[PDB]
Design an enzyme around this catalytic site. Structure first.
Site: not given
Ligand SMILES: Nc1nc(CCc2ccc3cc[nH]c3c2)cc(=O)[nH]1
Ligand SMILES: Nc1nc(CCc2ccc3cc[nH]c3c2)cc(=O)[nH]1
Lengths: 377, 377
Positions: A34, A220
């Protein structure tokens, strides 16, 4: 770096994960890659949706930091207990390292029922690292504790079941064709960059420069959609709509309030526009442009419980935190996060989904004036 | 209507629910009262977070409509199977009725683990009723099939454990003090209205009228926060921030990225501003204003797994779908949805949380020019 090629798996819309090990003896966990956050967090209790979880009781090398951490969203959230143990990455560089770890102990709408990942890896910067910037992110720790070069790159492919490559330490020229072009990282918090011009098909939105990066444009791996701010989503979508007038579709559809469908082998690629974002380039008044096909912004919803036809979703959507260049954009390109040089590089991905007609491009150089005036302050 | 007083329960931030029965023999279910959508939906399969669920197999009066329904969000969702059976409301009017029902059969981030509701009641209009406006909403059906007057009112209190009253059929003058003031429903889709002027403490944001209702202002029992658009949230928050300069707080906090805390009996009500939204009134150039305390926009996070102090959250937040007047605003007031008259009425709630100093008000009339020019088209 062949060792590291193909080391990311995942499922449609659920994100990309890489295998890491945490603690001695090593406990393997799939962690979600991430670039939009800066915390390393693992589920540490038996949440019913997790296949695995950090059992600190089995690790000699654990070390509590006697502190909490309460990461909310809108409206997910997670909270946990800061510690530190020895992290390693099986299909990564051959270094074990001691990094911070939030053991996640309560959470809301964070974990995904039916996913195969038990944690996040936040590859952005300390400034956004909750609870505060004293919490040294993994990657800062990996660099600071080894010879591993200060960069990583990402080739996210997505074919259902997705895959890709996180080359930790450098670049692997087998993952891209053509050449890499670099937009500078404006500030080291998120991977914030600046779109200096936006076209749909060729004709741009003639929008004020600032509205493309209000209040932020970021890159992202953790967002699925290409996400534009409201003013600009409004603008882009109208030009997309006009573009797309070989046909009509529901109002809601565009606002991500419905799916749209055709039959197997019966979808109109070419009635839909190519999009092009121009990013600030490395030199004064110099920019370059990256171009996505509609395969990138029209992504299939896989198992729909009342549908047999091809029902793709619309991957572009609105925001107030800004532009978020998600898997929609990132799946077009080999993306290099050159942290060493405060810059992000874009090349044509050797695995992006191209047809016989068009194709994804990274093209430059172009002349653009007043690129610096497209920030917000 | 004493029969119906106190007929809503719920828990902090999880929403307000009312008991209904569905099918013959009647199957009781707690359903979530939602003025922001227009579908009646119940979990119909054993999702692990549900206490109860619609078992169509036990109802003589069920009737499939052989059609699906796929309600996505950002990024929740639900999907189901349209049918029709006989709905009743124990602590409501004494009418059973035959309304549409989406039996929810798959869902993502919709149900809340640890809540006591198994379904939604969408009290808005057909126009936003997925899959399309042919799906006659419950309330249209309740009116069309009985003598029950075309209106309902809501007194949402919230004290942990929350409560309130949904008076189906009319108004109960024990639920409010002072007088009701009416803003017209601009279009019958959501409960869309128009804020013609916004003050914080008294000094307004001198913002262009249109930015308060870009692209929408709605009244939503289903949203928790007062939600302002980005431009206006930016604006309001800066004036809130300046207002609040007896003290400093983190940047993220404001963007709902952290909680903030003081000790038991040790929080500064009065360092924080009262807010006032002026809504379009019933007559040309006439408006009125409703005023919230900070008790309404600073709401406690109850069980925090690493905190003993008073850690309230900031209930105002950004959007691109528009202004959403949520439980933050609605808990100040007795709110009457006069559908018969295309208008919503606001009075001072007989249960709103007021201190000895200030208080929530509904005050008018004021003179405001060009109120109609604050719409968006
Ligand atoms: N870059 C991010 N990281 C998150 C947390 C990790 C996350 C949670 C759910 C999903 C579904 C698809 N990708 C995900 C990553 C939330 C967000 O708003 N931005
Ligand atoms: N008015 C609504 N209704 C919904 C669906 C019902 C819902 C789901 C979760 C929560 C949490 C608090 N209230 C909820 C309502 C979503 C939404 O965006 N607007």
């Amino acid at each position: 770096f062949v060792e590291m090629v193909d080391n990311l798996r995942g499922k449609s819309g659920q994100g990309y994960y890489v295998e890491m090990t945490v603690g001695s003896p090593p406990q393997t966990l799939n962690i979600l890659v991430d670039t939009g956050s800066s915390n390393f967090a693992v589920g540490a209790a038996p949440h019913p949706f997790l296949h695995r979880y950090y059992q600190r009781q089995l690790s000699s090398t654990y070390r509590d930091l006697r502190k909490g951490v309460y990461v909310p969203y809108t409206q997910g959230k997670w909270e946990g207990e800061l510690g530190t143990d020895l992290v390693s990455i099986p299909h990564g560089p051959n270094v074990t390292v001691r990094a911070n770890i939030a053991a996640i102990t309560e959470s809301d709408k964070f974990f995904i029922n039916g996913s195969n990942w038990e944690g996040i890896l936040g590859l952005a910067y300390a400034e956004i690292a909750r609870p505060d910037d004293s919490l040294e992110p993994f990657f800062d720790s990996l660099v600071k504790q080894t010879h591993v070069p200060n960069l990583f790159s990402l080739q996210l492919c997505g074919a259902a079941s997705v895959g890709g490559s996180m080359i930790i330490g450098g670049i692997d020229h087998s993952l891209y064709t053509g050449s890499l072009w670099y937009t500078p990282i404006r500030r080291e918090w998120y991977y914030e960059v600046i779109i200096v011009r936006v076209e749909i098909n060729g004709q741009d939105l003639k929008m004020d420069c600032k509205e493309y990066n209000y209040d932020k444009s970021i890159v992202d791996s953790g967002t699925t959609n290409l996400r534009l701010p409201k003013k600009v989503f409004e603008a882009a979508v109208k030009s997309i709509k006009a573009a797309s007038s070989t046909e009509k579709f529901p109002d809601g559809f565009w606002l991500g309030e419905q799916l749209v469908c055709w039959q197997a082998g019966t979808t109109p690629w070419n009635i839909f526009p190519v999009i092009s974002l121009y990013l600030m380039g490395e030199v004064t008044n110099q920019s370059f442009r990256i171009t996505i096909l509609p395969q990138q912004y029209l992504r299939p919803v896989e198992d729909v419980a009342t549908s047999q036809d091809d029902c793709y979703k619309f991957a572009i959507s609105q925001s107030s935190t800004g532009t978020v260049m998600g898997a929609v954009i990132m799946e077009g390109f080999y993306v290099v996060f050159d942290r060493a040089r405060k810059r992000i590089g874009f090349a044509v991905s050797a695995c992006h989904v191209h047809d016989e007609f068009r194709t994804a491009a990274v093209e430059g150089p172009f002349v653009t004036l007043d690129m610096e005036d497209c920030g917000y302050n």
